[PDB]
Amino acid sequence: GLFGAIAGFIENGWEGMVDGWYGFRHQNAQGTGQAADYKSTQAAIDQITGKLNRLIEKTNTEFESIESEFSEIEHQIGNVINWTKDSITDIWTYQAELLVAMENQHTIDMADSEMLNLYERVRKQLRQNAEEDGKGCFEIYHACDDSCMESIRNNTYDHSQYREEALLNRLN
């Protein structure tokens, strides 16, 4: 994808994640866990909603009939009507196909962009206390208990508190 995360350096999605589009998994001495991210999930959802709203909005042009269902039409004007109607249909069929294909390209790359935006947000939080494993995780160079993992999810993690421990661990 364009932002290289979904179907990118993140190898696959989590089918066990029901309460969100994006989220965290963690691992420490106490165990493993999983929570969803609200801000990033809603950013994607809201953007999808906007499109759906544009899709369903009414076009009020009321059209009358120009083709008797139950009787004959004069030949020359019939061939004219047919030409025009078919040309109009080719236009709409084309426009429709183009609309969706473009929108689908955008929704997909949009969702990719929000996954990345979360990842970047966390990268900058952890500063010099962690390193990227390249599969979409960060290896933390200090004991980060559950209350510490929670701090990172809730964007309250202060890097400076764990810096001296983390740095010496990274350097031996």
């Binding site: 979904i6 589009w21 965290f24 009939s65 429709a96 390209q105 929704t107 969702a111 996954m115």
Partner: protein, 318 residues
């Protein structure tokens, strides 16, 4: 210790087209082309008229089938297949143009022409094709004028309708076309026939065709119809010397109404703004694949079985 980022996925994704890929799996998607139709006419919220056996033109001239539809008001007008317009065989000049004007309207008012004739001319001519409760009759808005002295020449008689109303009226008249010479002479005499119709913005002369031809409903004679609009303040004189089907009343089209050509049954419980020959189309989707011939406020027709719009990310299962 470790913190991993990720996204959700599903067991069964859905395929969609993109700019770069025909077969792209996403977590979820929704249809943009409507495939379903309600095979009935959704007339809730509509003061509607079901003509049934009555054909729109029949309303103006007054065929027995159209007695209950000679006047009225409506926002929706429903025509059915094989609706009878002419009991006595014939047709109308610019029949389709006239039909559309009627189906474009929200009602009909009838106004009396006040036409009254000499004793030489008999206006009470009926036929076996247009019966009413057993006995023979005629188009209720017209009269058949013939000589009561059979064989004698049809008088040089004048009739004039003036439009005093603030809106244009639709006047119709008919020209009879005998099946032979002997017949033609019986009714309107031996002379060569002509019928003029004059108004400030219309003139046209009509000459009866005569010749042996097939029996449509046991009738070789034809009665064809012509029509024009008479503007406010103008009048329309009828010079005729034989074979005029003269109007006792004239029509006035009121408001605007949506015309629907369909045989599907009426439902007063559902409502709809898009109709077609097969029924109604209730959908918030911007496209449809049911027919390229619809009336109302419709989704645009496309040649597409389906077009799924992605409502989720690329699906990447475990």
């Amino acid at each position: 210790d470790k913190i991993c980022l990720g996204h959700h996925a599903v067991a069964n994704g859905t395929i969609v087209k993109t700019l770069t890929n025909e077969q792209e799996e996403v977590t979820n998607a929704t249809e943009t082309v409507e495939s379903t139709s309600l095979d009935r006419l959704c007339m809730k919220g509509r003061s509607h008229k079901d003509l049934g056996n009555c054909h729109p033109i029949g309303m103006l001239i007054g065929t027995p089938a159209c007695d209950l539809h000679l006047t009225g008001t409506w926002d929706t007008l429903i025509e059915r297949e094989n609706a009878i317009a002419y009991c006595y065989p014939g047709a109308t000049v610019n029949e389709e143009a006239l039909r559309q004007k009627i189906m474009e309207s929200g009602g009909i008012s009838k106004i009396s022409t006040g036409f009254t004739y000499g004793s030489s001319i008999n206006s009470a001519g009926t036929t076996k094709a247009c019966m009413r409760n057993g006995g023979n009759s005629f188009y209720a808005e017209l009269k058949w004028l013939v000589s009561k002295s059979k064989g004698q020449n049809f008088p040089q008689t004048t009739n004039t309708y003036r439009n005093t109303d603030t809106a244009e009226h639709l006047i119709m008249w008919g020209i009879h076309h005998p099946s032979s010479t002997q017949e033609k002479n019986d009714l309107y005499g031996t002379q060569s026939l002509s019928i003029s119709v004059g108004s400030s913005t219309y003139q046209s002369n009509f000459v009866p065709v005569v010749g042996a031809r097939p029996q449509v409903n046991g009738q070789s004679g034809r009665i064809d119809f012509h029509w024009t609009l008479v503007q406010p303040g103008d009048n329309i004189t009828f010079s005729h010397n034989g074979g005029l089907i003269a109007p006792s009343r004239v029509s006035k089209l009121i408001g605007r109404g949506l015309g629907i050509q369909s045989d599907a049954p009426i439902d007063n419980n559902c409502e709809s703004k898009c109709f077609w020959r097969g029924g109604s189309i209730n959908t918030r989707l911007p496209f449809q694949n049911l027919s390229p011939r619809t009336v109302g406020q419709c989704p645009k027709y496309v040649n597409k079985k389906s077009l799924m719009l992605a409502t989720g990310m690329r699906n990447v299962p475990e």
